[PDB]
Design a protein around this ligand. Structure first.
Ligand SMILES: [Mn+2]
Ligand SMILES: [Mn+2]
Ligand SMILES: [Mn+2]
Ligand SMILES: [Mn+2]
Length: 276
């Protein structure tokens, strides 16, 4: 139930700005018919979903034919959750859904930090002639928070300019080709408010092929799950979270969906435990 839970999970089946690889729209619904049979207990974290109050808000009803309209709707849903002093956990399609969600969170937490997991920088100003795209989401967010607020991990694909923007111009912190520095970054953000956005393609392409733009050279699941332990043992405050870019049909084995489901579980556990 809404009022009793501190974590509100909802889906956003939207991929309106994705041209050649649509499908992220099916992420939450694909996970829905799968999540049912997975264990509620996590042996890795030694936590159980059953010990917490988590609300399954289902999928957000969104308009069709207008990206602009969809973003406003996501913003609205997120805002109400934030307004009610609860943590919004969005399971979206494309990465653009993170922009309005982040805004709703930033409205209350002006001094917030962003933790970004992705195979792509998402720092380009435009993509397919649009300023608002899954590929420009972090640039949009940087326009809101500025330098020394964004931390990116696992990045391994992008234009030279996008990388310079972070590495040379230092507009964001970026760990290229890995996530090994995550524990250090998290400890440094001790006691800070964080918006965690996880683009699932941060995982290696052969491990998580059910995504729009697979990129070889990523981390496997065993390596990735370590971030859950690091967050659990840290003192960071996640006030907003999301996982995105799961595009089911592209992984005929169906394993990508299972991976998303498990990641969803561990994250709920981690956040739910901190809120206590
Ligand atoms: Mn990506
Ligand atoms: Mn992307
Ligand atoms: Mn992304
Ligand atoms: Mn391996």
């Amino acid at each position: 139930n809404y009022e009793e839970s501190n974590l509100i999970v909802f889906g956003v089946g939207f991929d309106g700005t994705t041209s050649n690889r649509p499908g992220a729209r099916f992420a939450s619904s694909s996970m829905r018919k799968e999540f049912y049979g997975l264990e509620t207990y996590s042996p890795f974290l030694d936590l159980d979903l059953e010990d917490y109050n988590i609300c399954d808000y289902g999928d957000l009803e969104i308009s069709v034919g207008s990206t602009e309209q969809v973003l406003k709707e996501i913003y609205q849903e997120t805002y109400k959750i934030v307004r009610d002093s609860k943590v919004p956990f969005m399971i979206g399609g494309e990465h653009l859904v993170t922009l309005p969600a982040f805004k709703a969170v930033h409205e209350k937490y002006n001094d917030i930090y962003v933790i970004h997991f992705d195979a792509h920088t998402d720092l380009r100003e435009e993509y397919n002639n649009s300023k608002n795209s899954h590929a420009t989401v972090i640039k949009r967010i940087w326009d809101i928070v500025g330098d020394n607020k964004i931390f990116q991990f696992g990045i391994r694909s992008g234009t030279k300019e996008e990388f310079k923007f972070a590495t040379e111009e230092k507009h964001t912190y970026m760990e290229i080709g890995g996530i090994d520095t995550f524990e250090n970054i998290v400890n440094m953000l001790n006691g800070k408010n964080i918006y965690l956005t996880i683009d699932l393609d941060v995982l290696d392409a052969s491990v998580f092929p059910g995504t729009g733009t697979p990129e070889p050279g990523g981390v496997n699941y065993r390596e990735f799950q370590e971030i859950f332990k690091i967050i659990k043992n840290s003192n960071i405050n996640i006030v907003g979270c999301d996982i995105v870019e799961l595009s089911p049909d592209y992984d005929t084995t169906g394993v990508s969906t299972v991976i998303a489901c498990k990641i969803l579980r561990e994250l709920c556990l981690i956040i739910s435990d901190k809120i206590k």
